[PDB]
Amino acid sequence: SANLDHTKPCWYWDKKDLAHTPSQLEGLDPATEARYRREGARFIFDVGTRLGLHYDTLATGIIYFHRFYMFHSFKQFPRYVTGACCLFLAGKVEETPKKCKDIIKTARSLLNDVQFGQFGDDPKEEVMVLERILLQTIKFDLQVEHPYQFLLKYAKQLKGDKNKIQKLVQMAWTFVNDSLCTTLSLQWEPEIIAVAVMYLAGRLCKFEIQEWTSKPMYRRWWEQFVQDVPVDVLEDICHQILDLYSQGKQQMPH
């Protein structure tokens, strides 16, 4: 959904297209969709963290969840059951598997009765059934890359005060986690999110990253890592992350 049909294993949409998700087409308010996405993401993060899963596994589950709701509505598919299913699938793909049973017990421990009521009378079965729909929906395209690897690789190429750079990376890593609550992973490649979270940390701390480039350059510092990315794109990404800290966002893109 969002735009055409044929931009599905091109897994990227303009923010504009995000006004046309299945849920919005069915009448759901943009702010409510945004909240359901943040709630589902944080649920996958919390469940996965309780199960001790590696951060790349939590991120893969969240990317599957965001892609799922480009083709189906929150009206039909309760968000926490999708979250559980996406984490279950991601643990298999990333070779850190967990029993469905254990994901369910963990969900029960973190959700109140009304939230856990989404799982119905047979929670394990609801998740196992949904996995088939999930796999078809994400076109069995299971391998995903996240911004964290690129944040580390690019920061390693910065030459300057080790303590300012360390701080930049710690702040930027928090911003990558935060970005997983938004639809940013459906808008830009993970290399561009990594440069944007470094750009955001630099702006917040008044750090001149341009001064840490290993050789002097005419063009914008990030042009050594990604090609033809205008500053306006980095600023858009920044604003969408900072929205999470300004109240509780609920700005579902358009």
UniProtKB/Swiss-Prot annotation:
One of its GO terms (cellular component) is cyclin K-CDK13 complex. Regulatory subunit of cyclin-dependent kinases that mediates activation of target kinases. Plays a role in transcriptional regulation via its role in regulating the phosphorylation of the C-terminal domain (CTD) of the large subunit of RNA polymerase II (POLR2A). GO terms for biological process: cell division; DNA damage response; negative regulation by host of viral genome replication; positive regulation of DNA-templated transcription, elongation; positive regulation of transcription by RNA polymerase II; positive regulation of transcription elongation by RNA polymerase II; regulation of cyclin-dependent protein serine/threonine kinase activity; regulation of signal transduction. The keyword Metal-binding does not apply. Widely expressed. Highest levels in testis. It is linked to Intellectual developmental disorder with hypertelorism and distinctive facies: An autosomal dominant neurodevelopmental disorder characterized by developmental delay and intellectual disability, language defects, and distinctive facial dysmorphism including high hairline, hypertelorism, thin eyebrows, dysmorphic ears, broad nasal bridge and tip, and narrow jaw. One of its GO terms (molecular function) is cyclin-dependent protein serine/threonine kinase activity. It comes from Homo sapiens. Its main location: nucleus. Belongs to the cyclin family. Cyclin C subfamily. Keywords: Cell cycle, Cell division, Cyclin, Disease variant, Host-virus interaction, Intellectual disability, Mitosis, Nucleus, Phosphoprotein, Transcription, Transcription regulation. This is Cyclin-K. Regulatory subunit of cyclin-dependent kinases. Identified in a complex with a kinase and the RNA polymerase II holoenzyme. Interacts with POLR2A. Interacts with CDK12 and CDK13. Interacts with CDK9 according to PubMed:10574912; does not interact with CDK9 according to PubMed:22012619. (Microbial infection) Interacts with human herpes virus 1 (HHV-1) transcriptional regulator ICP22. It is found in: Nucleus.
